[PDB]
Ligand binder design. Structure first.
Ligand SMILES: O=c1ccn([C@H]2C[C@H](O)[C@@H](COP(=O)(O)CP(=O)(O)OP(=O)(O)O)O2)c(=O)[nH]1
Ligand SMILES: [Mg+2]
Ligand SMILES: [Mg+2]
Ligand SMILES: [Mg+2]
Ligand SMILES: [Mg+2]
Ligand SMILES: [Mg+2]
Length: 901
DNA sequence: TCGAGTAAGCAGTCCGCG
DNA sequence: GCGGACTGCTTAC
């Protein structure tokens, strides 16, 4: 096989690299890498190296990496640009792996671990590590085994060995229900003291050194805990055995208000799964505890135990160890579904970076562009300092608040990367400027044509047309990867709907799910077999289709996030290619494009309908338009349609055959107007929305910008078995809204859009009557909690104290002097409840850590003093009032002259 | 919340508004 | 009571 790196580090004048060799074996080497950097030279000086602008450069070969760094400093002292890749390990990878890396994941050691630490005096601080580590479960991907290190003797209790037989048993048998598929994969090691446990763990770590290290909060908790505990017990040199090069650094992570410490293990790539999840999942969760996330992702029940975790080991060591094992497996189960590790490896190897650098689009793109330029013997510019400056972004159209019955939407494929490619926006393609007219003049095509030579953006910028910039070239490559994976995702989605249809009429038989590839549209043969399958088999197929869809989503959305990150990176001062001319060229062209196509679609629809000056486009945001199709529907008349699917087909056909050619003609004219390199403004039909045929549903509504709901029947080629609500921005979509309230508001919306006013009034009346029975957690608001100290004046709210911070302070007084009570963590999330006047807590609300039951110290007092009235008005009624007045509807029945009967 | 960007919505505090 | 100035939080894109 072709070789590939595992990890790379610079340590002084040496590169330390772990890698897989041509025979598929892991090796390590130390290389005295001689880096090169560059300086501009005279024209007369013969060279093959040129900066991105075509100015000649001489290569400076250094005796070592420290000489190279020192040279960069002196060039600053002199006042001269020092060109080239200043991160030497990135240049090393480029030289050493001068080809597209093809990696084999089966050779990469991926370690997933979790530790347990009993603590009677509060949260065990990883920087202190004053309490014994009493359990470690460490899954190794190469062995496919869970290694369990169990501490039997501790100052906090001596315990008996853990029993695998009881672990496997049902909870209804007094067992722990450790999943049977991992039982044979557990290698259990009890220890009589902590020192033996830790020395054996380090010997194990030496034999099976992680390349990729993950788990849940491993970077902020487990890794610093283990390191500092070992350091405390044995000293530094032993703790540094966690690094294969025996080098570690304490790293300070600084935020807006405060800072924390982590431990960098040189030669390991730590990818904390909580952080992978936050970056790649595109959710915002009320809580990030593993139980919460696991439940959300897998629909697995919460790990039940009695008492606090701090007394769990001594009261039920059996369950304690089982739950530590299950904790490790849950992260693996999430990964099987989300595939964020696979993603990270793909992106990391593509860019040629340390895999942990995937968290940084700036680092990722710097590497990609460096490698691309290096191939043409071009030399990257030095990074420079820039003051942060605000700059303009997208246009969002102000919608008229209303119900909207029939709606069709259109959206530009990868808007910003497409603009980059079309305009040829790049650091080295800047050709000059032209005199700018007001944006509205370009939108209405009355402004003077910017250029007859160069490709233009309405911000005043001009770009070369003879050759693609490096930014268009490289953004294109990742876009095509994105496009491929989106294809698989959509095919999996469409296949899902086929399965859902067949489920309505399943066969009464015993059989098996079909062996198929859900990334491709089902053949007719497959479709026929599907109609003859059982519910059991169909549901299993649905699950597999949906997993395939998720695999596709992960791959596509995060490649889109990567290319969109490059457009944003041009407006970040730390990016090597920061330039506000280029960032604003993108965003200003986007504004023009949207408003241009708005005018074109309006002009076209007025023409087909025979009207004049009427607004068909009701809304748009960044790169989308929402088109009212009432008039298109009315032109044939609702009476002509057999069923809902009939008018959906008609609208689908009208968009593809009439509107999209008009849209394409409109954008081609704009392309020529701007003299752009390549026409790439492609505005695919997204949604077809309206009420069920013959119903009293309203179809959709807007309340304002970025706030709307639609009853969708078809989403870019996916025809739904059951209509799907597309709700954007409304309270049903905010993590701050109580769970039960999200659900109730969504049903209210479903009824509005599908069934009409009376149905909505029926549901509201019922919800208002029963809601006080709802579980307190389901009706608690959620908020992030920053700057708790700032608003704390002697345990009481200071001036301008936010409502949720007020709640935390109320909580803090109520649990004061309890080092056992759960503490609210600065920067994390809390549940929030209003409290009735005259409550014993002495304030109008209380807050407690999100994802958890409130401590039994105060629970039933909270339940007794909950202000359901305020809770209802604030979270449910006020938002519902917003929805209904926008939609010109009433949630409560108005009195009629009929009432006199 | 270490980690590409801007636009913009709503909750809440403080305080004017004769 | 509402709304503007403001902070805080969250979402759409
Ligand atoms: O996090 C973001 C989201 C969007 N955009 C900018 C850049 C985006 O290009 C633009 C529009 O965003 P969408 O329409 O939502 C996604 P796109 O158009 O890229 O790709 P498809 O529509 O799925 O094909 O807004 C960003 O700069 N950052
Ligand atoms: Mg645990
Ligand atoms: Mg788009
Ligand atoms: Mg699309
Ligand atoms: Mg069937
Ligand atoms: Mg969009």
């Amino acid at each position: 096989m072709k070789e590939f790196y595992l990890t790379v580090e610079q340590i002084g004048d040496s590169i330390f690299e772990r890698y897989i060799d041509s025979n598929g074996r892991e090796r390590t080497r130390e290389v005295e890498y001689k880096p090169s950097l560059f300086a501009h030279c005279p024209e007369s000086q013969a060279t093959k190296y040129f900066d991105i602008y075509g100015k000649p450069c001489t290569r400076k070969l250094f005796a070592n990496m420290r000489d190279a760094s020192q040279w960069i400093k002196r060039m600053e002292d002199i006042g001269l640009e020092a060109l080239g890749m200043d991160d030497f390990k990135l240049a090393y990878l480029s030289d050493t792996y001068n080809y597209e890396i093809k990696y084999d994941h089966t050779k990469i050691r991926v370690a997933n671990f979790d530790i347990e630490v009993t603590s009677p005096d509060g949260f065990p601080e990883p920087s202190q590590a004053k309490h014994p580590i009493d359990a470690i479960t460490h899954y190794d991907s190469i062995d496919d085994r869970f290694y369990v290190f169990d501490l039997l003797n501790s100052p906090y209790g001596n315990v008996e060995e853990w029993s695998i037989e009881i672990a496997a048993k049902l909870q209804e048998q007094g067992g722990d229900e450790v999943p049977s598929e991992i039982i044979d994969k557990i290698i259990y090691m009890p220890f009589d003291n902590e020192k033996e446990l830790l020395m054996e763990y380090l010997n194990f770590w030496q034999q099976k050194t992680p390349v990729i290290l993950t788990g849940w909060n491993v970077e902020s908790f487990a890794i610093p805990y283990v390191y500092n505990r070992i350091k405390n017990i044995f000293g530094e040199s032993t703790a540094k055995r966690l690094s294969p090069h025996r080098k570690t650094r304490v790293k300070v992570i600084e935020n807006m208000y405060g800072s924390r410490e982590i431990i960098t293990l040189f030669g390991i790539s730590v990818l904390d799964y909580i952080d992978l999840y936050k970056k790649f999942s595109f959710t915002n969760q009320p809580s990030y505890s593993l139980d919460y996330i696991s439940e959300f992702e897998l629909n697995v029940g919460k790990l039940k135990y009695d008492g606090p975790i701090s007394k769990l080991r001594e009261s039920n060591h059996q369950r304690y160890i089982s739950y530590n094992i299950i904790a490790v497996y849950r992260v693996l189960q999430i990964d099987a579904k989300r595939q964020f590790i696979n993603l990270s490896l793909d992106m990391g190897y593509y860019a040629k970076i340390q895999i942990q650098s995937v968290f940084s689009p700036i680092k990722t793109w710097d590497a990609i562009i460096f490698n691309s330029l290096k191939e043409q013997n071009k030399v990257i510019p030095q990074g420079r300092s820039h003051p942060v400056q605000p700059y303009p972004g997208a246009f969002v159209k102000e919608p008229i608040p209303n119900r909207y019955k029939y709606v069709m939407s259109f959206d530009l494929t990868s808007a910003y990367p497409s603009i980059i490619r079309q305009v040829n926006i790049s650091p080295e393609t800047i050709a000059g400027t032209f005199k700018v007219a007001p944006l509205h003049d370009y939108i209405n095509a009355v402004a003077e044509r910017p250029s007859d030579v160069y490709s233009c953006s309405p911000n005043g910028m001009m770009y070369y047309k003879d050759r693609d910039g490096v930014v268009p070239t490289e953004i294109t490559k990742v876009f095509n990867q994105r496009k491929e994976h989106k294809g698989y995702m959509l095919a999996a989605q469409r296949n899902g709907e086929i399965i859902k249809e067949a489920l309505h009429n399943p066969n009464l038989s015993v059989d098996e799910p079909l062996d198929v590839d859900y990334r491709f549209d089902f053949s007719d043969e497959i479709k026929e077999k599907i109609k003859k399958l059982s519910a059991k088999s169909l549901n299993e197929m649905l699950f597999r289709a949906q997993r395939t869809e998720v695999a596709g989503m992960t791959a596509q959305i995060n490649r889109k996030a990567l290319i969109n990150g490059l457009a944003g990176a041009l407006g970040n001062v730390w990016f090597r290619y920061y330039d506000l001319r280029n960032a604003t060229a993108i965003t200003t062209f986007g504004q023009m494009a949207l408003q241009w196509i708005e005018r074109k679609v309006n002009e076209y629809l007025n023409e087909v309908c025979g009207t004049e000056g009427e607004a068909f486009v009701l809304y748009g945001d960044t790169d989308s338009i929402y088109v009212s199709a009432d008039k298109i529907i009315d032109k044939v008349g609702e009476s002509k349609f057999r069923d809902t699917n009939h008018w959906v087909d008609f609208l689908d056909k009208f968009a593809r055959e009439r509107m999209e050619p008009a849209i394409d003609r409109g954008f081609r004219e704009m392309c020529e107007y701007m003299n752009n390199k390549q026409h790439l403004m492609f505005m695919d039909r997204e949604a077809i929305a309206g009420p069920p045929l013959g119903s009293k549903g309203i179809g959709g509504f807007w309340t304002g910008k970025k706030r709307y709901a639609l009853n969708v029947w078809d989403m870019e080629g996916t025809r739904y078995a059951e209509p799907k609500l597309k709700i954007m921005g409304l309270e049903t979509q905010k993590s701050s809204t109580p769970k039960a309230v999200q659900k109730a508001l969504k049903e209210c919306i479903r009824r509005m859009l599908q069934e009409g006013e009376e149905s909505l009034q029926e549901y509201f009346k019922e919800f208002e009557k029963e809601f006080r029975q709802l579980n307190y957690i389901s009706i608690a608001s959620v908020s992030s909690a920053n700057n708790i100290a700032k608003y704390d004046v002697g345990g009481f709210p200071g001036p301008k104290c936010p409502f949720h911070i007020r709640g935390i302070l109320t909580y803090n007084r109520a649990i004061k002097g309890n080092i056992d009570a759960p503490q609210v963590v600065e920067g994390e999330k809390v549940y929030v409840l209003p409290l009735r006047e005259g409550n014993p807590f002495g304030d109008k609300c209380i807050a407690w850590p999100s994802g958890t039951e409130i401590t039994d110290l105060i629970k039933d007092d909270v339940l007794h003093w909950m202000d359901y009235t305020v809770l209802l008005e604030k979270t449910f009624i006020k938002p519902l009032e917003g929805f209904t007045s926008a939609a010109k509807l009433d949630y409560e029945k108005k009195a009629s002259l009929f009432d006199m009967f």
